[PDB]
Structure 1
């Protein structure tokens, strides 16, 4: 019938005012930017270390308003061990009229894959377990018909016992400048989206996993291009130049035309590339790093691969409920996106 408002308290961290319920204590900044500022906290109600993201003036434009709604809808949907999920969402605002701030609460993680790939020297069993968890989370995400679109080591978060969660799905929107040059922001992207060959699907994320897996196995970035074209050449050297069948799938005439200008190359022998690696790891890599996106292994298919024999459990690899994505094609005003967001904030039910 009803729900009770908690008591809020105010607190400044690095020149920004945080107003949060009393349950959240020991707030400590971890990061900031356009992706919102994030603090670590201790939730006294659940005994959980949590991350709290503040979105300030998330309704300054139509695109900001829609993105705020999108992020909240995304987080509300995900209920899976290997996917970041919403523990709590709140606003200190008492009505829609004063509602101009959104806080999102998730589990606090210990490090990202960039931070761990360094502190440590990973074994094959470590790689098995990390990649298994990524694919387990991806199976769930893809089953809701959500594409991550920007899978990289920086949005894969890990705790001390190597338990992994996927962050930042469905919401990456980089500028041209951020994708230019010798930059990690582009190194994990599938060729078809890097050069906009065609309308992309979920198979884009599997390419990213292959890149991440290779890096975990070798300690080296697989395709560290100095630019879009240099990266493509790195990719084509390994996987071969496109055949006739794939060329007609490239709907972009300019892109298909550039491809045809290149000297044709055969697929390399992956056993001569990833020397000393588990042959099962090499085999899976060959199935993930396929130029034709239609022919790439799926997350669900990859979980059943022999490489994951010690972790695979078909009764413990769940799919998601349907995700209603119809808002994406909808054109609304700021106050309409704001009202929708507000409804989602108040309708939130905490996890058991």
Structure 2
């Protein structure tokens, strides 16, 4: 048991191991507030997140468990990993707080084409990894991507409007989806880095769809066959029909290989959209691609998602995961 010490900052008690020094508030993360700190063990800067009321209800309790399970699993250069997890509690009975420690993430995301190449390559390399364990991000956007001064990138979640980057199949719920919802988001981010402008800045779900269809065209007879929802089918067929634009005439003067890749990412049909692994092998990435250094994840059991448990049961499962943690 390490020695803990207490303090108050921003009208909240932080009780942390002596290992972590000089805590400094940096704002809110996903379901908690965050401080920067100094890790005396390595001499590096770290981010410490104290979760907000982790066990107040069933939903909070299961989302606390979800995040801890996920962070303990993800071990890859372009994805956030877990340095430490702790509680000041000495027993399950008095267990009420959870703190998660990671490396101190940098600032978030016109750029040079060489820069666009390296940043999109790193995002796809991280996505090949998470997708290989059937983990889907679902909220990829520039503010959820950390980049240091070396231009190294990690995918994370800090909890730009989300609707601007959302795949139509999960925003409107109109056909089956797969991991490629994240690929649509990547296409939207890449366009923005090439142009300096948000590609589809919609005001609501309806405006958003209107802006999308202006570029990709109204679904034809072949895609309409896969639209599960009758409401959505009627909607689509009632619009004034829009043709597909030539992307080359939209992204004027971009690298033609970039324009080709964008054409393969920004398709409405989820069965036809390029996957992360396929996109790594596209000619655009010739300078960076190495099929021997693009690893997959160990399998991830998420059978817990389908379970219906009491607050104290999620709490005991979370306690177990704190106890069983082993440092990298």
TM-score normalised to structure 1 length: 0.90
Aligned partners of 1:170, 1:143: CA distance in 2, in Å? 23
* 3-state DSSP of counterpart to 1:145: coil
For 2:159 and 2:13, how far apart are their aligned partners in 1? 28
Q: How many residues align?
A: 328
Answer yes or no: is the 8 Å Cα contact 1:51–1:108 preserved in 2: yes
In 1, distance between residues paired with 2:103 and 2:234?
A: 47
Contact 1:110 / 1:159 at 8 angstroms: preserved in 2?
Answer: yes
Note if contact 2:31-2:52 (Cα within 8 Å) is conserved in structure 1. no
Q: TM-score when scaled to structure 2? A: 0.97
1:287-345 CA distances to partner (integer Å, 9 max, x unpaired)?
00001011000000001111111111111111000010100001000000000001001
What do the CA deviations read for 1:40-94 (whole angstroms, capped 9, x no partner)?
A: 1111112221111111320100011000000001101100000011111111110
2:277 paired with 1:300: yes
- The alpha carbon displacement at 1:159 in A equals 0.8
Residue 238 of structure 2: SS of its match in structure 1? coil
Deviation at 1:32, TM superposition (A): 2.3
Q: Is the 8 A contact 1:148 1:170 kept in 2?
A: no
Structure 1 residues 311 and 34 mapped into 2: Cα distance closer, same or farther (>3 Å)? closer
User: Tell me, what secondary structure is at the counterpart of 1:86?
Assistant: coil
Partners of 2:30 and 2:157 within 8 A in 1: no
Between the aligned partners of 1:161 and 1:212, the Cα distance in structure 2 is: 20
For 2:210 and 2:132, locate their aligned partners in 1 and report how far apart those are by CA, in whole Å: 33
Structure 2 residue 32 is matched with structure 1 residue 36:
yes
**Gap regions ≥5 residues in structure 1:** 114-120, 173-184
| C-alpha contact (below 8 Å) 1:157/1:164 kept by paired residues | yes
1:171 Cα offset (Å): 17
Conservation of the 8 A alpha-carbon contact between 1:147 and 1:169: no
CA distance in 2, matches of 1:195, 1:220: 24
Give 1:257 shift: 1.4
2:172 maps to 1:195: yes
Q: Which runs of 5+ in 2 are unaligned?
A: none
CA distance in 2, matches of 1:134, 1:47: 28
User: Alpha-carbon deviation of 1:169?
Assistant: 9.2
